[PDB]
Curated annotation (Swiss-Prot), chain A:
Domain of life from the UniProt record: Viruses
Free-text comment about domains: Contains sequence and structural motifs very similar to those of a bacterial superantigen and can directly bind and activate T-cell receptors. Activation of a broad T-cell repertoire may be involved in the hyperinflammatory syndrome in acute COVID disease. The KxHxx motif seems to function as an ER retrieval and binds COPI in vitro.
Location(s), subcellular: Virion membrane; Host endoplasmic reticulum-Golgi intermediate compartment membrane; Host cell membrane
Protein name from the UniProt record: Spike glycoprotein
Organism per entry: Severe acute respiratory syndrome coronavirus 2 (2019-nCoV)
Name of the gene encoding the protein in the UniProt record: S
Modifications made to the protein after synthesis: The cytoplasmic Cys-rich domain is palmitoylated. Palmitoylated spike proteins drive the formation of localized ordered cholesterol and sphingo-lipid-rich lipid nanodomains in the early Golgi, where viral budding occurs.
Glycosylation sites: N13, N49, T68, N90, N98, N182
């Protein structure tokens, strides 16, 4: 999109910002590019009362975005939602007259990758003196192998528990007619 | 129709609007593929799962180039350049560093495995409760009134398609808690009393279907001097006119 | 230290992940609805008194008395605010642990959501559940008188509506007394809010 | 080593807090936005509202 950036000095008063610094680069402050938030000092962004949904979190209720206004970077206060007010009375009610069928999707992870590690090849490789020296350091690698094997078995256990509810393999009828429903 | 009865709507509502419901379901199913394809970051969780393992393995491989305070990171150079009784103190540092790296990797893997196991248990519960039956828990198998669900498989994960019922096109009405008649109070069996401005009917909860007030769908069980906000009207006895 | 690998990158990554997960948890818990409902100006609900849980407009932060007691009961050490280096260099001859932590590279970041936004979310949820019942949780909010909603709930638990409609005043008085006793019960117990204090 | 120990403890505590937050979110969804029939999930007795 663009090469423009903004800087945030964390937990620093805007009056105490340094202008000999450890970083060689420095950003020069103009009249309207300096803002003070409860998270620190922001340089390179402009503040407005226009409120939108949060795009890039910054601090306590302050977000930043890239807006065309000439494109630039702006900072604002995040909006909770649309304003509403339902009328209440003790002798009135509201009743729906129509309906809508909706379909929604949900994604859930199940398992991950199963990995194995060889101690001798990773630590010492082909060296024999290194292996002899490592032989007197205990049995950590046995514990490592046991933990990895346990994780590997648990992955397959999770998959089996999730995807093996029924023990019968049903088949759909050859004729696909279900009262007008298209599957 | 059984499912609509389960959510609290009579079967005649379904049987009189079969084509519209089928068309709405078909359109909702058709929109799903376009919605999934248009969104670039829809399947972010599985990609994160893959990327975490890839990054962990890459970091473990990259860690082999560290010196850990020794003179070199290659064992052959140390062996060929140093006294055999002296080269041991250089190999010890490398061994300790690589052991620490392995310990860190194993601990991170164990924590991630615990998180994945929790997620898999939640997914199995959702499979058991939303697909094999109808759930009455709020916001457990989608937003709205749950009807049914469909499972699909994905790399290292599952995808649930929930079908829900949403009311729409509401209207205002005047209501009363009970109806007074012949010095007796009447309450609806199922539904609510409704007034269109002149007359009074009784309807069900989630669909507007006015009916004539009758002793068949009301019960008295009380008097007419204690209910606050009662309104008096006429209750119709079905058998009396036909004798 | 430059030749000891990249452990610190992993440390930073883990800390950043935890920091993001905290805000994610807060957002998942407290952002169920996307509409900001408002309570009607007239506070009459068939004899039910909700003054102890509704926001108080007199105070600046607009918090209910119960929320006031809850916030006063829990003592917080650092809220992630600007612990300015000027405060540490003030040299009031009373060196606290916060300045010692700050001088050694340990810092605390503020949360994304402020207390006012969480209070607004709670107030919106309360208004929605009072003026509509459970309809706003599955679609558009539908108005309904409160006694009728409570009669619906009694029918849900397995009791006929005439039981409610003939004992409205007694039920309202019992609810009012039970709500009133809650503040006294919370204030009297010294170790009521132990979990949050343990977390701190 | 001190930093590693601190980070591991923080990760474990974060996992526990995440589990607690998930439980709290489920309770918010089920007890406040509706009426629950699960025994001893939204209080002791017959649940009315929250
Ligand atoms: C309930 O909503 C459906 C869906 O919007 C309405 O069906 C539409 O009716 C209009 C007017 O006849 C048609 O132009 C549309 O093509 C219909 N849509 C579909 C998907 O069939 C239905 O009319 C509404 N019910 C009432 C009583 O107004
Ligand atoms: C169920 O929906 C599918 C998808 O729209 C229908 O398949 C389409 O059928 C038309 C008519 O033969 C073709 O022109 C399209 O190319 C098909 N689409 C695809 C993606 O193959 C299918 O016909 C519908 N079922 C019924 C019984 O009408
Ligand atoms: C409320 O409902 C009643 C009953 O349906 C309506 O009365 C009917 O009005 C139509 C139109 O004038 C007449 O043709 C019917 O004969 C009336 N029915 C009876 C039983 O008298 C009444 O109009 C409705 N109120 C409003 C404001 O529309
Ligand atoms: C709802 O309960 C509150 C709390 O008891 C009532 O507020 C009290 O009102 C009386 C009479 O004006 C005062 O003497 C008390 O000092 C009030 N208490 C507090 C804590 O402010 C309130 O009046 C009740 N609502 C109604 C409609 O009666
Ligand atoms: C920044 O310094 C000025 C100096 O007078 C002070 O008034 C102000 O309160 C300080 N702001 C913060 C957030 O510390
Ligand atoms: C932003 O809103 C505040 C609050 O009313 C107002 O005082 C200020 O002038 C506004 N700033 C601009 C640039 O419009
Ligand atoms: C509620 O009922 C009372 C009757 O005592 C009435 O005065 C009041 O206007 C009603 N509420 C509304 C919003 O009309
Ligand atoms: C019901 O009446 C209220 C107040 O007059 C109004 O705000 C609302 O829009 C009405 N409902 C419908 C469906 O028109
Ligand atoms: C019917 O209701 C009206 C309106 O409140 C009332 O004036 C009248 O007395 C009632 N009829 C009887 C028989 O009580």
């Amino acid at each position: 999109t663009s090469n423009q950036v903004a800087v945030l000095y964390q937990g620093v008063n805007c009056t105490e910002v340094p202008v000999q610094l450890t970083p060689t680069w420095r950003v020069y402050s103009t009249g309207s590019n300096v803002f003070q938030t409860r998270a620190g000092c922001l340089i390179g962004a402009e503040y407005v009362n226009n409120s939108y949904e949060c795009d890039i979190p910054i601090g306590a209720g302050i977000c930043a975005s890239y807006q065309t206004q000439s494109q630039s970077i702006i900072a604002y206060t995040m909006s909770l939602g649309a304003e509403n007010s339902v009328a209440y009375s003790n002798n009135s009610i509201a009743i729906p007259t129509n309906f809508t069928i909706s379909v929604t999707t949900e994604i859930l992870p199940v398992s991950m990758t199963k990995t194995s590690v060889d101690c001798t090849m990773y630590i010492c490789g082909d060296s024999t003196e290194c292996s002899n020296l490592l032989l007197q350091y205990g049995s950590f690698c046995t514990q490592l192998k046991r933990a990895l094997t346990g994780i590997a078995v648990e992955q397959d256990k999770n998959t089996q528990e999730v995807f093996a509810q029924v023990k019968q393999i049903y088949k759909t009828p050859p004729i696909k007619y279900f009262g007008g429903f298209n599957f | 129709a059984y499912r609509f009865n389960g959510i609290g709507v009579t079967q005649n509502v379904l049987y009189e609007n079969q084509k519209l419901i089928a068309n709405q379901f078909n359109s909702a199913i058709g929109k799903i593929q376009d919605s999934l394809s248009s969104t670039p970051s829809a399947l972010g969780k599985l990609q994160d799962v893959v990327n975490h393992n890839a990054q962990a393995l890459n970091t473990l491989v990259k860690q082999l180039s560290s010196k850990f305070g020794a003179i070199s990171s290659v064992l052959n150079d140390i062996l060929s350049r140093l006294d055999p009784p002296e080269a041991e103190v250089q190999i010890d540092r490398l061994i300790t560093g690589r052991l620490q790296s392995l310990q860190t990797y194993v601990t991170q893997q164990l924590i991630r495995a615990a998180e994945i196991r929790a997620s898999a248990n939640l997914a199995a519960t959702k499979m058991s409760e939303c697909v094999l039956g109808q759930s009455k828990r709020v916001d457990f198998c989608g937003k709205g009134y749950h009807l049914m669900s469909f499972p699909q498989s994905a790399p290292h994960g599952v995808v649930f398609l929930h079908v829900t019922y949403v009311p729409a096109q509401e209207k205002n009405f005047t209501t009363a808690p009970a109806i007074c008649h012949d010095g007796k109070a009447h309450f609806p069996r199922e539904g609510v009393f409704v007034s269109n401005g002149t007359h009074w009917f009784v309807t069900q909860r989630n669909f507007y279907e006015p009916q004539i007030i009758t002793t068949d769908n009301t019960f008295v069980s009380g008097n007419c001097d204690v209910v606050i906000g009662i309104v008096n009207n006429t209750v119709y006895d079905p058998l009396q006119p036909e004798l | 230290l430059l030749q000891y690998g990249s452990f610190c990158t992993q440390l930073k990554r883990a800390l950043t992940g935890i920091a993001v997960e905290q805000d994610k948890n807060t957002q998942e818990v407290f952002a169920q609805v996307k509409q900001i409902y408002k309570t009607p100006p007239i506070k009459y609900f068939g004899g039910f008194n909700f003054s102890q849980i509704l926001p108080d407009p007199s105070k600046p932060s607009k918090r209910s008395p119960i929320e006031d007691l809850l916030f006063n009961k829990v003592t917080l050490a650092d809220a992630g605010f600007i612990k300015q280096y000027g405060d540490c260099l003030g040299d009031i001859a009373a060196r606290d642990l916060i300045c010692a932590q700050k001088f050694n590279g340990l810092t605390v970041l503020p949360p994304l959501l402020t207390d006012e936004m969480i209070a607004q979310y709670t107030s919106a949820l309360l208004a929605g559940t009072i003026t509509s019942g459970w309809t706003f949780g599955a679609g558009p909010a539908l108005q309904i008188p409160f006694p009728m909603q409570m009669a619906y709930r009694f029918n849900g638990i397995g009791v006929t509506q005439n039981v409610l409609y003939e004992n409205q005043k007694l039920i309202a008085n019992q609810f009012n007394s039970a709500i009133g006793k809650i503040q006294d019960s919370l204030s009297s117990t010294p170790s009521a809010l132990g979990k949050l204090q343990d977390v701190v």
